[PDB]
Design an enzyme around this catalytic site. Structure first.
Site, PDB file in Angstrom:
ATOM      1  CG  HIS A  16       0.245  -3.604 -24.047  1.00 29.17           C
ATOM      2  ND1 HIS A  16       0.245  -5.149 -24.179  1.00 29.17           N
ATOM      3  CD2 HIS A  16      -0.610  -3.042 -23.631  1.00 29.17           C
ATOM      4  CE1 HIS A  16       0.060  -5.556 -23.479  1.00 29.17           C
ATOM      5  NE2 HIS A  16      -1.173  -4.451 -23.587  1.00 29.17           N
ATOM      6  CG  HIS A  51      -3.509   0.588 -23.648  1.00 32.64           C
ATOM      7  ND1 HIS A  51      -4.430  -0.908 -23.428  1.00 32.64           N
ATOM      8  CD2 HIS A  51      -2.846   0.930 -22.842  1.00 32.64           C
ATOM      9  CE1 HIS A  51      -3.760  -1.801 -22.280  1.00 32.64           C
ATOM     10  NE2 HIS A  51      -2.687  -0.498 -21.693  1.00 32.64           N
ATOM     11  CD  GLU A  69      -3.093  -4.220   5.555  1.00 35.62           C
ATOM     12  OE1 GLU A  69      -3.770  -4.053   4.978  1.00 35.62           O
ATOM     13  OE2 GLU A  69      -3.517  -4.017   6.997  1.00 35.62           O
ATOM     14  CG  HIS A  84      -9.893  -9.099  13.457  1.00 36.40           C
ATOM     15  ND1 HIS A  84     -10.897  -8.588  12.811  1.00 36.40           N
ATOM     16  CD2 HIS A  84      -8.767  -8.458  13.362  1.00 36.40           C
ATOM     17  CE1 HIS A  84     -10.634  -7.653  13.254  1.00 36.40           C
ATOM     18  NE2 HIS A  84      -9.138  -6.830  13.604  1.00 36.40           N
TER      19      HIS A  84
HETATM   20  C1  LIG Z   1      -3.909  -1.568  12.200  1.00 35.14           C
HETATM   21  C2  LIG Z   1      -5.347  -1.700  13.087  1.00 35.14           C
HETATM   22  C3  LIG Z   1      -5.647  -0.819  13.539  1.00 35.14           C
HETATM   23  C4  LIG Z   1      -5.280   0.322  14.321  1.00 35.14           C
HETATM   24  C5  LIG Z   1      -6.209   1.913  13.970  1.00 35.14           C
HETATM   25  O1  LIG Z   1      -5.770   2.395  14.182  1.00 35.14           O
HETATM   26  P1  LIG Z   1      -7.015   4.281  13.892  1.00 35.14           P
HETATM   27  O2  LIG Z   1      -7.807   3.547  12.421  1.00 35.14           O
HETATM   28  O3  LIG Z   1      -6.409   5.044  13.986  1.00 35.14           O
HETATM   29  O4  LIG Z   1      -7.651   3.871  15.201  1.00 35.14           O
HETATM   30  P2  LIG Z   1      -8.274   4.878  16.318  1.00 35.14           P
HETATM   31  O5  LIG Z   1      -7.959   5.595  16.223  1.00 35.14           O
HETATM   32  O6  LIG Z   1      -8.262   3.415  16.886  1.00 35.14           O
HETATM   33  O7  LIG Z   1      -6.558   4.025  17.016  1.00 35.14           O
HETATM   34  S1  LIG Z   1      -7.438  -1.437  14.849  1.00 35.14           S
HETATM   35  C6  LIG Z   1      -7.395  -2.676  14.240  1.00 35.14           C
HETATM   36  C7  LIG Z   1      -7.282  -4.075  14.939  1.00 35.14           C
HETATM   37  O8  LIG Z   1      -7.757  -5.153  14.828  1.00 35.14           O
HETATM   38  C8  LIG Z   1      -9.342  -4.512  15.729  1.00 35.14           C
HETATM   39  O9  LIG Z   1      -9.425  -4.037  13.823  1.00 35.14           O
HETATM   40  C9  LIG Z   1      -6.375  -4.003  16.626  1.00 35.14           C
HETATM   41  O10 LIG Z   1      -6.910  -3.411  16.992  1.00 35.14           O
HETATM   42  C10 LIG Z   1      -7.189  -5.108  17.151  1.00 35.14           C
HETATM   43  O11 LIG Z   1      -7.934  -5.779  17.579  1.00 35.14           O
HETATM   44  C11 LIG Z   1      -5.711  -5.749  17.561  1.00 35.14           C
HETATM   45  O12 LIG Z   1      -4.624  -4.900  17.109  1.00 35.14           O
HETATM   46  C12 LIG Z   1      -5.320  -7.270  18.984  1.00 35.14           C
HETATM   47  O13 LIG Z   1      -4.221  -6.830  20.069  1.00 35.14           O
HETATM   48  P3  LIG Z   1      -3.847  -8.189  20.670  1.00 35.14           P
HETATM   49  O14 LIG Z   1      -4.181  -8.275  22.040  1.00 35.14           O
HETATM   50  O15 LIG Z   1      -4.122  -9.686  19.361  1.00 35.14           O
HETATM   51  O16 LIG Z   1      -2.575  -7.670  20.407  1.00 35.14           O
HETATM   52  N1  LIG Z   1      -5.509  -3.023  13.229  1.00 35.14           N
HETATM   53  C13 LIG Z   1      -5.523  -4.195  12.647  1.00 35.14           C
HETATM   54  C14 LIG Z   1      -6.349  -4.022  11.118  1.00 35.14           C
HETATM   55  C15 LIG Z   1      -4.931  -4.315   9.818  1.00 35.14           C
HETATM   56  N2  LIG Z   1      -5.302  -4.302   9.322  1.00 35.14           N
HETATM   57  C16 LIG Z   1      -6.792  -4.310   8.537  1.00 35.14           C
HETATM   58  C17 LIG Z   1      -7.373  -4.034   6.809  1.00 35.14           C
HETATM   59  N3  LIG Z   1      -7.501  -4.250   9.686  1.00 35.14           N
HETATM   60  C18 LIG Z   1      -7.547  -4.436  10.579  1.00 35.14           C
HETATM   61  N4  LIG Z   1      -8.548  -3.978  11.663  1.00 35.14           N
HETATM   62  C1  LIG Z   2      -6.040  -2.312 -16.786  1.00 34.50           C
HETATM   63  C2  LIG Z   2      -4.821  -1.941 -17.776  1.00 34.50           C
HETATM   64  C3  LIG Z   2      -4.026  -1.658 -18.158  1.00 34.50           C
HETATM   65  C4  LIG Z   2      -5.140  -0.080 -18.033  1.00 34.50           C
HETATM   66  C5  LIG Z   2      -3.704   0.852 -18.425  1.00 34.50           C
HETATM   67  O1  LIG Z   2      -3.802   2.243 -18.681  1.00 34.50           O
HETATM   68  P1  LIG Z   2      -3.355   3.149 -18.635  1.00 34.50           P
HETATM   69  O2  LIG Z   2      -2.284   2.840 -17.157  1.00 34.50           O
HETATM   70  O3  LIG Z   2      -2.858   4.683 -18.423  1.00 34.50           O
HETATM   71  O4  LIG Z   2      -1.659   2.806 -19.261  1.00 34.50           O
HETATM   72  P2  LIG Z   2      -1.445   3.465 -20.994  1.00 34.50           P
HETATM   73  O5  LIG Z   2      -1.101   4.870 -21.121  1.00 34.50           O
HETATM   74  O6  LIG Z   2      -0.425   2.375 -21.630  1.00 34.50           O
HETATM   75  O7  LIG Z   2      -3.120   3.430 -21.745  1.00 34.50           O
HETATM   76  S1  LIG Z   2      -3.005  -2.435 -18.859  1.00 34.50           S
HETATM   77  C6  LIG Z   2      -3.538  -3.981 -18.079  1.00 34.50           C
HETATM   78  C7  LIG Z   2      -3.563  -4.956 -19.401  1.00 34.50           C
HETATM   79  O8  LIG Z   2      -3.657  -6.372 -18.478  1.00 34.50           O
HETATM   80  C8  LIG Z   2      -1.367  -5.377 -19.815  1.00 34.50           C
HETATM   81  O9  LIG Z   2      -1.293  -5.359 -18.777  1.00 34.50           O
HETATM   82  C9  LIG Z   2      -4.843  -4.877 -20.427  1.00 34.50           C
HETATM   83  O10 LIG Z   2      -4.052  -3.926 -21.528  1.00 34.50           O
HETATM   84  C10 LIG Z   2      -4.171  -6.253 -21.547  1.00 34.50           C
HETATM   85  O11 LIG Z   2      -3.207  -6.529 -22.128  1.00 34.50           O
HETATM   86  C11 LIG Z   2      -5.214  -6.376 -22.105  1.00 34.50           C
HETATM   87  O12 LIG Z   2      -6.345  -5.589 -22.039  1.00 34.50           O
HETATM   88  C12 LIG Z   2      -5.775  -7.315 -23.172  1.00 34.50           C
HETATM   89  O13 LIG Z   2      -6.692  -7.698 -23.808  1.00 34.50           O
HETATM   90  P3  LIG Z   2      -7.288  -9.136 -24.739  1.00 34.50           P
HETATM   91  O14 LIG Z   2      -6.906  -8.326 -25.900  1.00 34.50           O
HETATM   92  O15 LIG Z   2      -7.203  -9.886 -23.655  1.00 34.50           O
HETATM   93  O16 LIG Z   2      -9.202  -8.215 -24.771  1.00 34.50           O
HETATM   94  N1  LIG Z   2      -4.372  -3.930 -17.544  1.00 34.50           N
HETATM   95  C13 LIG Z   2      -5.451  -5.000 -16.897  1.00 34.50           C
HETATM   96  C14 LIG Z   2      -5.145  -4.680 -15.148  1.00 34.50           C
HETATM   97  C15 LIG Z   2      -6.160  -4.246 -14.319  1.00 34.50           C
HETATM   98  N2  LIG Z   2      -5.290  -4.379 -13.045  1.00 34.50           N
HETATM   99  C16 LIG Z   2      -3.810  -4.365 -12.473  1.00 34.50           C
HETATM  100  C17 LIG Z   2      -3.848  -4.690 -11.328  1.00 34.50           C
HETATM  101  N3  LIG Z   2      -2.812  -4.985 -13.379  1.00 34.50           N
HETATM  102  C18 LIG Z   2      -3.630  -4.797 -15.337  1.00 34.50           C
HETATM  103  N4  LIG Z   2      -2.380  -5.694 -15.763  1.00 34.50           N
END
Ligand SMILES: C=C1[C@H](CCOP(=O)(O)OP(=O)(O)O)S[C@H]([C@](O)(CO)[C@@H](O)[C@H](O)[C@H](O)COP(=O)(O)O)N1Cc1cnc(C)nc1N
Ligand SMILES: C=C1[C@H](CCOP(=O)(O)OP(=O)(O)O)S[C@H]([C@](O)(CO)[C@@H](O)[C@H](O)[C@H](O)COP(=O)(O)O)N1Cc1cnc(C)nc1N
Ligand SMILES: [Ca+2]
Ligand SMILES: [Ca+2]
Lengths: 675, 675
Positions: free
Chosen positions: B25, B259, B413, B476
């Site tokens: 690149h 690129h 996360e 979950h």
């Molecule tokens: C962080 C939040 C969440 C926080 C959300 O805050 P929010 O979006 O602001 O919602 P509110 O306004 O209602 O407060 S909700 C969630 C739960 O998993 C539910 O989906 C969680 O409430 C569990 O049910 C609970 O912790 C279980 O308790 P326990 O008795 O087992 O100890 N959660 C976890 C969560 C974390 N990450 C993702 C990707 N998805 C999720 N659902």
């Molecule tokens: C989308 C972009 C990328 C796009 C980035 O655009 P940018 O951040 O704006 O960078 P520039 O200014 O240099 O253009 S880079 C990437 C690569 O995987 C490199 O890390 C990619 O360039 C490959 O090397 C290439 O496609 C291989 O070509 P080929 O000969 O095999 O066909 N990439 C893929 C990518 C997609 N998603 C994640 C999480 N990470 C990544 N590295």
């Protein structure tokens, strides 16, 4: 008023459901009941026809608040009752602890994992725009529906929602209207501890329109006005800030304790008395609320009845488009569409499976209008765009049109995955796909798993499947990825070896109605195999080279099938006779009859698997496994294969060791088990 | 000038490296060479001591631009030479196609997967703030270093960077200075096709400071001034907008074609002549550039020499803190720290392993100052905060202090995972952890895999491990998750069954120096086991119940070990004698001697595995596998276990079937193989 009574009814149904389960989340339902009442009164929907294609869609992205959604669905007479509410969170009920589209009538998507639903809403809205651009005509607004999404602070913290919100703003998706439950409380307490950004300023930076409702605990007039305002802004998605009190009405309102645990019994009593309900009664549904909601249903049903007559008139005026639309609403692909799939013979040149995929797409996109798809900034590497198609973009940009078929997702794998789920959820037979490198499908695992749980026929075009990609090195080279997705229920993971197998993989992916597909494709060229066909590869696993007196069978996928065939020749020189099985999709194979599977992997012969990634899973099909259980390397791909002994001689050596290891042992198929 | 010559040298080294590999690149290296020159001239670092704890750190988040980083490291006399540049992207070289911290001197982290490096930079900066707050004293600025990050458009599209940028703004991390390569080009072409948001407005909304450099192709004076400006803003991270031309100088500058592929040979010739270099020469390093860069190294080495004297004076003035700091810089935990680990007996009460984890943390955090950690908005569910500790927050908020030990990550996360990698990368023996539900560790897979590849001793406190969580339901409940991470090289996946095993899991996680840990912990209570100990669980797998005349051995993990013990009693009533093996960490077990492993899983006896999730991987240790290969359910947990027959009777039935299936067969350990 009846509106006030309806809001109280919703609040108390949700609280009573949580109480009955002694589990679940009362806070956001209490805070969002006014908004839910207002939104559903503006929505067009038929409880008796959940699949009406011109319905407005609603998505509860804060899925823990599901007691609110279930209460709405019950009050409106969906196929969900108060008796189902009484079984909230109980095994086997229609009211699970987070909404599931497979189980809950009126749940468009499966939410619970935060961030997903808003992205699904972006996909529903993307599909509606594409659909409308494809079918609408003067005097024929076949599609003109909105997408309403509720979301909370947690959804706004998850990066997937930022990805989708940036893209939705770019795409000018004016029929998307999202509502932020701005209650300043998450599980860890005040949002002041972790989430102090200016959300509204961020959404303006994406190109969204904003409406703020400062009193959303009571001001349904302002919520309705915010919807009307959003509908006038046709070139921007809208975020409505609903400033609410979590747990509104509870003694514990405004605290984290009301987010996620049942209210105290005395709290529920005071809620009921303050709102004019009987504190001794649970699951009350005042008949005047039912009457008011039934009036809105009846009006919506008259709207759908008029839409059906519009559709009949459309079929007369636009006979070809009308028949296409009818076929899609019936869930049927074009007759004999699969005749467009390319077929190869062993005389044809070696081709990378990424390029074979491009060729398939080139042939099937013109034949199957419900195919749309895109790539996460890897279009020239994944080879996912058919030449001559137009991108899906707002025409105002000059870069495409909403009638376009190719989506520029940008570097947004996770949102791409969740948007694909929303496009599938829209319906109308959409068969949609998304390209990235296989190793970066992992960025989207949250959404991929939901494709499987939700039973959506989405497709990942996942190129650069292995160390065969070469110089980009171990940060790009999958090891664990196929094992991860194969271990997930309901994911078809195709790893085609050649042209015919790539056509079979697409046949499966496009015909799918309930199973997401991942197509693991190569950067490097692979030969056309003697013995492959679409017919046999359609079985998921098949005997490529039959050897009646086999000393060993080698089972392989993808790039390693040709390696196995070359190893067979080395083995012949050593006096060992091998057969070869190609296993392009383990899930499809598993679904074949026991007898078919045993014809491929019989008793009485050792079986060695070969695949240049994790050996996990492979003991289902083999006695010994030759895989790659360490990270890769940055170098020219053939040199990496040689380093790890994925060569004809290295496979033959391990095959010979396998034959020796089973000398004098009784061998039964890996398909046998004790239970 | 010499600065102009240095910039040309950097550009041409990068271009020549790509040319030699015929891969890689050139575009972003050409565009970012002025900025790289300016930043490295401001940075304090010692090429001869890459681990100086008060160095400024640099992170190339746009890792594909690595030819630029390698050129800087070569020019500054790190342990990387022009001969290594000539081997760019070649198997076994010190110049892989994306930077790897294990392989490349001066690469702080492993990048290539977009979005990760900026988040790693947030973690390095978080650690520096915590470290400085812990150790600095009046007249003793032990830690005062900066974190410089380069990032491109792709990084800004990835949601993980939004998560970390929101959090970094909240945390007021003023020693973080990031530089956006604003070149308006990604792989799919102009950013107008997918990325039209107002980035600067978004970063202001997070609470970042902004500096814009409109002429970053040439204006190194403005880049240096932007750094000085950023250093004066002590309460905000800074984003410097570098408006550059991708591929600056190339005939193909400003296009997507520059690129990711080598330049044409004639293009490289005209680059060299326009910049005063010999078009016939490659890998030129003008001695005046070396001299200028050596002057800066010599000054930096004098700064480190003074820091060493400051540290010696600190040890005299602050003897206890000084000895603590010395121990940490030596990579050693406190002597006998593990005496703080709780120990249990079978007479003690049943406890969920999430609560056992809380208790461990409560005991070890006061004893081991280099432990810090947090949760992704699940503190009261994961039980990850020790009572009485203070949160890591800027003191200006009133919510914590930078000396705090507990991080409120919010619902982030993926960024938490990448931030943990940056905290580990800072060094100083940090042993850091992050809590979420096991099923949502999957949101962070991009970063988790990099923990493994980068060899960082980070720990996920991953509660709610199974259907045992109950009512929250299948969105979950993990199924595939342990198989995914166990299939990834270099991840220790502990699933402790009881109190003693939970202490062993933490002993492993905290003592780790090169292997990330995931601790899969229960919501539900589990009994203390007869036969468990820290000593035996430290072996990863051990014989819990020895039966010399066993008809079967049941191998299990976590919540299923107690189930196996109960099944042993049912089997005894059926006339079947079973042994039980507990396998709390497969990786640790695998690393034991062959003889130890065979003492646990001997020849001559059928072995059944039991774990309430995917059966993938389990054939390494068993002949038959009882697992859960379908999604879960929303209901009370004991009812879900009964539904799926994870009961003493269900395990016994399958054990009896296993004994019957092997009647009259010769059985060898699953640990045996042919090769
Ligand atoms: C962080 C939040 C969440 C926080 C959300 O805050 P929010 O979006 O602001 O919602 P509110 O306004 O209602 O407060 S909700 C969630 C739960 O998993 C539910 O989906 C969680 O409430 C569990 O049910 C609970 O912790 C279980 O308790 P326990 O008795 O087992 O100890 N959660 C976890 C969560 C974390 N990450 C993702 C990707 N998805 C999720 N659902
Ligand atoms: C989308 C972009 C990328 C796009 C980035 O655009 P940018 O951040 O704006 O960078 P520039 O200014 O240099 O253009 S880079 C990437 C690569 O995987 C490199 O890390 C990619 O360039 C490959 O090397 C290439 O496609 C291989 O070509 P080929 O000969 O095999 O066909 N990439 C893929 C990518 C997609 N998603 C994640 C999480 N990470 C990544 N590295
Ligand atoms: Ca909230
Ligand atoms: Ca760019």
């Amino acid at each position: 008023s009846v509106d006030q009574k309806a809001i109280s009814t919703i609040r108390l149904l949700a609280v009573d459901a949580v109480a009955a389960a002694n589990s679940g989340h009362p806070g956001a339902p209490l805070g969002l009941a006014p908004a839910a009442h207002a939104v559903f009164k503006k929505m067009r929907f038929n409880p008796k026809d959940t699949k009406w294609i011109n319905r407005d869609r609603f998505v509860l992205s804060n899925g823990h608040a599901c007691a609110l959604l279930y209460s709405m669905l019950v009050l409106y007479g969906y196929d969900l009752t108060v008796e189902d509410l009484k079984k909230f969170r109980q095994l086997g009920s229609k009211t699970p602890g987070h909404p599931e589209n497979t189980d809950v009538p009126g749940a468009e998507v499966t939410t619970g994992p935060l961030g997903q639903g808003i992205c699904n809403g972006v996909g529903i809205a993307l599909a509606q725009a594409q659909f409308a651009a494809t079918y609408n005509k003067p005097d024929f607004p076949i599609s003109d529906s909105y997408t309403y999404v509720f979301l909370g602070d947690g959804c706004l913290m998850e990066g997937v929602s930022s990805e989708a919100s940036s893209l939705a703003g770019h795409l000018q998706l004016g029929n998307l209207i999202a509502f932020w439950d701005d209650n300043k409380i998450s599980i860890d307490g005040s949002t002041e501890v972790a989430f102090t950004e200016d959300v509204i300023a961020r959404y303006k930076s994406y190109g969204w329109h904003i409406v703020e409702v400062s009193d959303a605990d009571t001001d349904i007039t302002a919520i309705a006005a915010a919807i009307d305002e959003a509908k006038k802004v046709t070139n921007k998605p809208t975020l409505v800030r609903l400033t609410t009190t979590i747990g509104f009405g509870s003694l514990a309102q405004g605290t984290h304790g009301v987010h996620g645990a049942p209210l105290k019994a005395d709290d529920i009593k005071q809620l009921k008395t303050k709102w004019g309900f009987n504190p001794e009664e649970s699951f009350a549904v005042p008949a005047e609320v039912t009457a008011s909601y039934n009036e809105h249903v009846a009006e919506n049903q008259k709207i759908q009845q008029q839409w059906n007559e519009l559709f009949a008139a459309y079929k007369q005026k636009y006979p070809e488009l009308g028949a296409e639309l009818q076929r899609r609403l019936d869930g049927k692909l074009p007759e004999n569409w699969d005749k467009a799939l390319p077929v190869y013979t062993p005389a044809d040149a070696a081709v990378a499976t990424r390029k074979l995929s491009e060729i398939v797409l080139s042939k099937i996109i013109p034949e199957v209008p419900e195919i749309i798809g895109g790539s996460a900034d890897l279009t020239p590497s994944n080879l996912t765009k058919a030449k001559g198609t137009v991108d899906f973009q707002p025409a105002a940009t000059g870069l495409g049109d909403y009638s376009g078929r190719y989506i520029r997702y940008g570097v947004r794998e996770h949102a791409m995955g969740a948007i694909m789920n929303g496009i599938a959820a829209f319906g109308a037979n959409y068969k949609n796909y998304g390209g990235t490198f296989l190793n970066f499908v992992s960025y989207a695992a949250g959404a991929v798993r939901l494709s499987a749980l939700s039973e959506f026929p989405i497709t990942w075009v996942a190129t650069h499947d292995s160390i065969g990609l070469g110089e980009d090195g171990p940060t790009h080279q999958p090891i664990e990825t196929l094992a991860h997705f194969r271990a997930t229920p309901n994911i078809s993971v195709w790893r085609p070896a050649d042209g015919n197998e790539t056509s079979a993989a697409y046949k499966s992916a496009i015909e799918s109605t309930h199973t997401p597909h991942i197509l693991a494709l190569t950067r490097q060229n692979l030969p056309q195999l003697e013995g492959s066909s679409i017919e046999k590869a359609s079985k998921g696993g098949y005997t490529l080279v039959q050897q009646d007196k086999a000393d060993i069978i080698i089972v392989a996928t993808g790039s390693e099938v040709s390696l196995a065939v070359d190893a067979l020749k080395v083995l012949e020189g050593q006096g060992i006779k091998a057969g070869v099985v190609s296993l392009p999709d383990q899930l499809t194979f598993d679904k074949q009859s026991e007898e078919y599977k045993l014809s491929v992997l019989p008793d009485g012969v050792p079986i060695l698997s070969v695949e240049v990634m994790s050996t996990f899973g492979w003991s289902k099909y083999s006695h010994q496994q030759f895989g790659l259980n360490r990270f890769g390397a940055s170098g020219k791909a053939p040199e990496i294969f040689k380093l790890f002994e994925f060569t004809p001689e290295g496979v033959a050596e391990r095959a010979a060791k396998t034959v020796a290891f089973y000398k004098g042992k009784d061998v039964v198929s890996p398909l046998r088990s004790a239970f």
